[PDB]
Amino acid sequence: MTFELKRVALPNGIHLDVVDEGPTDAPVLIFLHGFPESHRTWRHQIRHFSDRFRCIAPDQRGYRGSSKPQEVAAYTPDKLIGDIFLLADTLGIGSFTIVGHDWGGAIAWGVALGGQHLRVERAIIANAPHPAIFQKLLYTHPVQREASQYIRGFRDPANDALVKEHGLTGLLMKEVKWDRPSAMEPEERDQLLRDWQNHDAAFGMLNYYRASPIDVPTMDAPFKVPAGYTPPQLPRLTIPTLVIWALDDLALPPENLEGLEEIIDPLTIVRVPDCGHFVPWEAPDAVNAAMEGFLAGH
């Protein structure tokens, strides 16, 4: 399966290749993939909703044919969040629902929190931790700290020799702490294996972790918030928000949902039992069902 991509030049000097399907003046859903995927992550939802919604899905910075600057700092969270507002600007989209999975969901939380009521009318987040919650969990909760040890591997510049020899695939093969995808259609797998052979993309994709200010301690460090840690002041999220959470995601255990109710209103949580990390395509019918109910005009 293939979507037509268009190249969108942005005023920060980046271009993004993007899916743009559906009626031009329909309500907009902007879909953000995570690592190590592509605009294809939300394929099932894009095809499901593009009869009624304008569906935008970029290959984000660092991915596939989009700009792949090699410097780590080109991937700081502000830049990744900024790319989405600039993409909406360039396409003439005043307000949209932001939809994100994994890194796309982390970016989506930022987009929603910053842009709510001005640019962002609803948020849909699937298996991506909330920035008010995640850093604290890494400090306090062994389940989460253990779950996130792969990030330390992805950050280790001693692994770059392996990426240069074997593409991203070599590091994914080597990094046993990384939670691997479940069974996917052969055509989808083939595309990713081809994508992962591009050196510049492999590093751009890894740079999300390398540029992130998130602190993932070793399992040796005390399970307490450091004395000098100041929790970023965030606003509450006061746009309609759907959080979808596959319960067998080994990277992002369900503890990530604790505390969401206090900081989001109106919040809907849809737990997906017996499903791993890649929920948009591992459980597309549950995801489509959740989105249908949530997006309904009543």
Author numbering: 1 to 298
Can you quote the paper on this entry?
Epoxide hydrolases (EHs, EC 3.3.2.9) are enzymes that catalyze the in vivo hydrolysis of an epoxide ring to the corresponding vicinal diols. Two novel EH enzymes of the α/β fold class have been identified from metagenomic samples from diverse locations in Russia and China. The nucleophile Asp102 in Sibe-EH (Asp101 in CH65-EH), is complemented by His277 and Asp249 (His270 and Asp241) to form a catalytic triad.
The ORF found in the Russian metagenome (Sibe-eh) is 891 nt long and encodes for a protein (Sibe-EH) of 297 amino acids that has 30% identity with the CH65-EH protein sequence. Sibe-EH is monomeric in the crystal structure and in solution which is similar to many other bacterial EHs and plant, such as potato, EHs. All residues of Sibe-EH plus one His residue belonging to the C-terminal His tag have been modeled into the electron density. The amino acids Pro36 and Pro266 are in the cis- conformation in the Sibe-EH structure. The Sibe-EH was active on all tested substrates resulting in conversions > 99% for substrates (2), (5), and (6), around 90% for substrates (3) and (4), and around 40% for substrate (1). Sibe-EH displayed an optimum temperature at 30°C and retained more than 40% of activity at 40°C, while CH65-EH showed the highest activity at temperatures around 50°C and retained more than 60% of activity at 70°C. The substrate epoxide oxygen binds to the side chain hydroxyls of Tyr150 and Tyr209 in Sibe-EH, and its likely position is marked by a conserved water molecule interacting with these residues. In the case of CH65-EH and Sibe-EH the entrance to the active site cavity as seen in B. megaterium EH is totally obstructed by the adjacent monomer in the CH65-EH dimer and by a very different conformation in Sibe-EH in the region of residues 159–180. The high ee observed for the meso-epoxide in the Sibe-EH reaction can be explained by the formation of favorable protein-ligand hydrophobic interactions when the ligand is attacked at the (S)-carbon to release the (R, R) product.
